[PDB]
Amino acid sequence: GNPLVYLDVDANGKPLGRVVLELKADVVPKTAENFRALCTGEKGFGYKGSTFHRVIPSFMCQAGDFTNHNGTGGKSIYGSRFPDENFTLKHVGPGVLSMANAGPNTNGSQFFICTIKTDWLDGKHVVFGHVIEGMDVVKKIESFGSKSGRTSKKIVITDCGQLS
Numbered sequence: 001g002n003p004l005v006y007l008d009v010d011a012n013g014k015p016l017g018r019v020v021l022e023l024k025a026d027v028v029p030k031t032a033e034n035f036r037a038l039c040t041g042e043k044g045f046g047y048k049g050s051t052f053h054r055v056i057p058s059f060m061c062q063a064g065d066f067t068n069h070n071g072t073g074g075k076s077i078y079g080s081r082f083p084d085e086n087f088t089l090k091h092v093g094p095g096v097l098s099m100a101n102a103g104p105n106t107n108g109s110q111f112f113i114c115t116i117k118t119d120w121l122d123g124k125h126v127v128f129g130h131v132i133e134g135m136d137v138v139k140k141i142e143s144f145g146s147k148s149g150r151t152s153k154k155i156v157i158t159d160c161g162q163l164s
Protein backbone atom coordinates (compact mmCIF):
# COMPACT_ATOMS: atom_id res chain seq x y z
CA GLY A 1 0.00 0.00 0.00
CA ASN A 2 0.81 3.71 0.19
CA PRO A 3 3.86 4.64 2.27
CA LEU A 4 3.53 5.87 5.84
CA VAL A 5 6.31 8.21 6.94
CA TYR A 6 7.02 10.21 10.09
CA LEU A 7 8.50 13.50 11.25
CA ASP A 8 9.58 13.92 14.88
CA VAL A 9 9.53 17.63 15.67
CA ASP A 10 11.20 19.74 18.40
CA ALA A 11 10.39 23.32 19.35
CA ASN A 12 13.30 25.10 21.03
CA GLY A 13 15.03 21.76 21.59
CA LYS A 14 12.14 19.96 23.30
CA PRO A 15 10.02 17.30 21.59
CA LEU A 16 6.47 18.08 20.45
CA GLY A 17 5.84 14.53 19.21
CA ARG A 18 5.37 12.80 15.88
CA VAL A 19 3.53 13.66 12.68
CA VAL A 20 2.64 10.57 10.63
CA LEU A 21 1.89 11.14 6.94
CA GLU A 22 0.30 8.88 4.32
CA LEU A 23 1.83 9.50 0.89
CA LYS A 24 -0.60 9.00 -2.00
CA ALA A 25 1.78 7.03 -4.24
CA ASP A 26 -1.25 5.57 -6.03
CA VAL A 27 -2.12 9.07 -7.33
CA VAL A 28 1.26 10.86 -7.42
CA PRO A 29 3.95 8.17 -7.34
CA LYS A 30 6.87 10.43 -8.32
CA THR A 31 6.01 13.11 -5.78
CA ALA A 32 5.36 10.53 -3.04
CA GLU A 33 8.65 8.74 -3.77
CA ASN A 34 10.64 11.95 -3.51
CA PHE A 35 9.18 12.75 -0.09
CA ARG A 36 9.55 9.16 1.12
CA ALA A 37 13.25 9.00 0.24
CA LEU A 38 13.91 12.45 1.74
CA CYS A 39 12.37 11.14 4.99
CA THR A 40 14.56 8.02 5.09
CA GLY A 41 17.63 9.96 3.93
CA GLU A 42 18.61 6.96 1.80
CA LYS A 43 20.10 9.08 -1.02
CA GLY A 44 22.51 10.74 1.45
CA PHE A 45 20.43 13.87 2.09
CA GLY A 46 16.94 14.75 3.27
CA TYR A 47 14.82 16.29 5.96
CA LYS A 48 16.61 15.09 9.12
CA GLY A 49 17.82 18.12 11.07
CA SER A 50 15.99 20.71 8.94
CA THR A 51 13.31 23.18 10.04
CA PHE A 52 9.79 24.48 9.66
CA HIS A 53 10.96 27.93 8.50
CA ARG A 54 7.63 29.51 7.49
CA VAL A 55 4.50 29.00 9.59
CA ILE A 56 1.32 31.08 9.25
CA PRO A 57 -1.54 30.52 11.72
CA SER A 58 -4.86 29.57 10.11
CA PHE A 59 -3.03 28.71 6.89
CA MET A 60 -0.14 26.22 6.87
CA CYS A 61 3.21 25.04 8.21
CA GLN A 62 6.05 24.96 5.66
CA ALA A 63 9.31 23.01 5.82
CA GLY A 64 11.75 21.04 3.68
CA ASP A 65 14.47 23.55 2.80
CA PHE A 66 17.31 21.36 4.03
CA THR A 67 19.99 23.22 2.05
CA ASN A 68 19.33 26.92 2.84
CA HIS A 69 16.82 26.67 5.73
CA ASN A 70 14.96 29.80 4.54
CA GLY A 71 12.63 28.98 1.63
CA THR A 72 15.10 29.48 -1.22
CA GLY A 73 16.63 25.99 -1.27
CA GLY A 74 15.97 22.27 -1.19
CA LYS A 75 16.43 19.66 -3.89
CA SER A 76 14.60 16.54 -5.03
CA ILE A 77 15.96 13.03 -5.40
CA TYR A 78 15.69 13.49 -9.19
CA GLY A 79 17.63 16.75 -9.52
CA SER A 80 17.11 20.30 -8.28
CA ARG A 81 13.48 20.58 -9.43
CA PHE A 82 10.82 18.33 -10.97
CA PRO A 83 7.48 18.79 -12.77
CA ASP A 84 4.02 19.10 -11.34
CA GLU A 85 2.88 15.48 -11.50
CA ASN A 86 -0.85 16.23 -11.46
CA PHE A 87 -3.42 18.29 -9.55
CA THR A 88 -5.84 15.43 -8.91
CA LEU A 89 -5.84 15.65 -5.09
CA LYS A 90 -7.31 18.85 -3.67
CA HIS A 91 -6.53 21.06 -0.68
CA VAL A 92 -9.61 19.81 1.12
CA GLY A 93 -8.91 20.81 4.72
CA PRO A 94 -6.55 20.65 7.69
CA GLY A 95 -3.89 17.93 7.44
CA VAL A 96 -3.35 18.12 3.68
CA LEU A 97 0.30 17.59 2.66
CA SER A 98 1.28 19.54 -0.46
CA MET A 99 4.37 20.67 -2.35
CA ALA A 100 5.65 24.21 -1.98
CA ASN A 101 6.93 25.74 -5.20
CA ALA A 102 8.05 28.90 -7.00
CA GLY A 103 5.63 28.58 -9.91
CA PRO A 104 4.78 25.80 -12.35
CA ASN A 105 7.10 22.78 -12.38
CA THR A 106 9.42 23.88 -9.56
CA ASN A 107 8.94 21.13 -6.99
CA GLY A 108 12.06 20.36 -4.98
CA SER A 109 11.86 19.31 -1.35
CA GLN A 110 9.80 22.06 0.28
CA PHE A 111 6.35 21.11 1.49
CA PHE A 112 3.54 22.32 3.67
CA ILE A 113 0.89 20.90 5.95
CA CYS A 114 -2.36 22.83 5.79
CA THR A 115 -4.24 23.82 8.93
CA ILE A 116 -7.34 24.91 6.98
CA LYS A 117 -8.93 24.24 3.58
CA THR A 118 -6.74 26.13 1.09
CA ASP A 119 -8.83 25.78 -2.08
CA TRP A 120 -7.07 28.61 -3.94
CA LEU A 121 -3.96 26.42 -4.17
CA ASP A 122 -5.84 23.74 -6.13
CA GLY A 123 -4.26 23.44 -9.58
CA LYS A 124 -1.12 25.29 -8.42
CA HIS A 125 0.40 23.00 -5.76
CA VAL A 126 0.63 19.23 -5.99
CA VAL A 127 -1.16 17.57 -3.07
CA PHE A 128 0.48 14.24 -2.27
CA GLY A 129 -0.63 13.08 1.18
CA HIS A 130 -2.21 13.84 4.51
CA VAL A 131 -1.72 13.64 8.25
CA ILE A 132 -2.67 10.21 9.68
CA GLU A 133 -1.65 11.02 13.25
CA GLY A 134 -0.24 14.05 15.05
CA MET A 135 -2.49 16.96 14.11
CA ASP A 136 -1.95 18.00 17.75
CA VAL A 137 1.74 18.41 16.89
CA VAL A 138 0.84 20.34 13.74
CA LYS A 139 -1.37 22.68 15.81
CA LYS A 140 1.55 23.27 18.19
CA ILE A 141 3.82 24.13 15.26
CA GLU A 142 1.10 26.40 13.86
CA SER A 143 0.83 28.23 17.21
CA PHE A 144 4.51 29.21 16.91
CA GLY A 145 3.95 30.96 13.57
CA SER A 146 2.99 34.53 12.72
CA LYS A 147 1.29 36.52 9.96
CA SER A 148 4.72 37.10 8.37
CA GLY A 149 5.57 33.38 8.51
CA ARG A 150 8.40 34.00 10.99
CA THR A 151 8.47 31.37 13.73
CA SER A 152 8.71 32.36 17.40
CA LYS A 153 10.38 29.06 18.36
CA LYS A 154 12.98 27.08 16.41
CA ILE A 155 11.03 24.17 14.92
CA VAL A 156 13.28 21.27 13.94
CA ILE A 157 12.60 17.88 12.35
CA THR A 158 14.98 15.95 14.61
CA ASP A 159 14.20 12.54 13.11
CA CYS A 160 12.20 11.24 10.18
CA GLY A 161 11.72 8.03 8.29
CA GLN A 162 9.41 5.38 6.89
CA LEU A 163 7.00 3.27 8.96
CA SER A 164 5.63 1.11 6.13
Ligand SMILES: CC1=NN(c2cccc(S(N)(=O)=O)c2)C(=O)C1
Binding pocket: 054, 070, 071, 072, 099, 100, 101, 102, 103, 110, 149
Ligand atom coordinates in the same frame (compact mmCIF):
# COMPACT_ATOMS: atom_id res chain seq x y z
C1 LIG B 1 7.07 34.98 1.62
C2 LIG B 1 7.76 33.70 1.60
N1 LIG B 1 7.46 32.70 0.66
N2 LIG B 1 8.16 31.72 0.83
C3 LIG B 1 8.07 30.51 0.01
C4 LIG B 1 9.18 29.70 -0.30
C5 LIG B 1 9.01 28.56 -1.10
C6 LIG B 1 7.73 28.22 -1.59
C7 LIG B 1 6.63 29.05 -1.27
S1 LIG B 1 5.05 28.72 -1.83
N3 LIG B 1 4.82 29.49 -3.41
O1 LIG B 1 4.06 29.30 -0.84
O2 LIG B 1 4.84 27.23 -1.93
C8 LIG B 1 6.79 30.19 -0.48
C9 LIG B 1 9.10 31.91 1.97
O3 LIG B 1 9.91 31.10 2.38
C10 LIG B 1 8.82 33.30 2.52
